[PDB]
Amino acid sequence: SKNEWRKSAIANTLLYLRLKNIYVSADDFVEEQNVYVLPKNLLKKFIEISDVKIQVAAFIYGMSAKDHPKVKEIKTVVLVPQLGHVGSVQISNIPDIGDLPDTEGLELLGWIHTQTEELKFMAASEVATHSKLFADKKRDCIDISIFSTPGSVSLSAYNLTDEGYQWGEENKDIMNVLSEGFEPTFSTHAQLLLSDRITGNFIIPSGNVWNYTFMGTAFNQEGDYNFKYGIPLEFYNEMHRPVHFLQFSEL
């Protein structure tokens, strides 16, 4: 029963300023492993549409460069219907985008999301949803976790061990009261490189709306959504809150 979105919508305005400070965790370089290249424009645009407190997520699709099979260039970010929360997010199914142009040979590389908490590993909720999404579908999908906090954004990319996938399957819900035998060893540093010499684009639900906090029960996690290329709306866009306009419209 709170009116605190006001404060939050105003805050999101300034999110672009955080892009002055972009940190990417790079440990020891390895030539035997895959490296993931995220276009800087996609980071920029993805932050700008994000929220200051609520978590926001998207799938990432790309393909191996012509030269190196182990260099996975990210080509597209796919915003799907989701329901954001603090420190967690309910994400709808891996989208069907086969009918779309320029998707010839696209590989599902994993997902990307914001976070209000800096870490060296995948949190519980990260493992919970990561498993739910990719457990039965694709195990090598990575998790690009973006920690955005007043002043900067910090990017870390993780793989998930089969143990992690088991744990996530067991802990299916998001209210993890058990938190039983969680392990920072589930996740694993993944090489994430940021590049501004390659440009990427978004794919979005046909009805535009991807954020369903105010849409409420209209969010169906098992929904078959249709998609298209397009410019994603920001978190507190007009179409994301007919309620606020209705509440005002009357009386």
CATH number of the domain at 192, please. Answer: 3.40.140.10
Q: Is 228 within the bounds of a domain?
A: yes
**Contact by Cβ (8 Å): 59, 80:** yes
**Contact by Cβ (8 Å): 81, 210:** yes
C-alpha closest to that of 82 among 235, 207, 241, 213: 213
Domain around 185:
1-241
- State the angle between helix axes of 162-170 and 124-134 in degrees (0 to 180), rounded to the nearest 10: 100
C-alpha closest to that of 210 among 241, 232, 228: 232
Q: Is 249 within the bounds of a domain?
A: no
Phi, psi of 219 (to 5 degrees): -70, 120
Between CA 97 and CA 100 the distance in angstroms is 6
Helix spans in the chain (H): 5-12, 40-48, 124-134, 162-170, 242-249
Q: β-strands 152-160, 142-149: how paired?
A: antiparallel
Residue 128, Cα to own-chain centre: how many angstroms? 14
Q: Is 33 within the bounds of a domain?
A: yes
Q: How far is residue 232 from each of residues 78, 136, 219, measured CA to CA in Å?
A: 9, 28, 18
Q: Is 246 within the bounds of a domain?
A: no
Structural domains counted in the chain? 1
Q: Is 40 within the bounds of a domain?
A: yes
Tell me, what DSSP letter sits at residue 105?
T
Using CA atoms in the order 81, 73, 106, 131, what is the torsion angle rounded to 10 degrees? -50
Between CA 13 and CA 51 the distance in angstroms is 9
Residue 59 tokens read as 């799938």
Render 143-159 in DSSP notation, one character per residue: EEEEEEETTEEEEEEEE
Residue 1 tokens read as 């029963």
Q: Is 247 within the bounds of a domain?
A: no
Buried b (16+ CB within 10 A) or exposed e, 27-45: eeeeeeebbbbbbbebbbb
Residue 119 tokens read as 């870490």
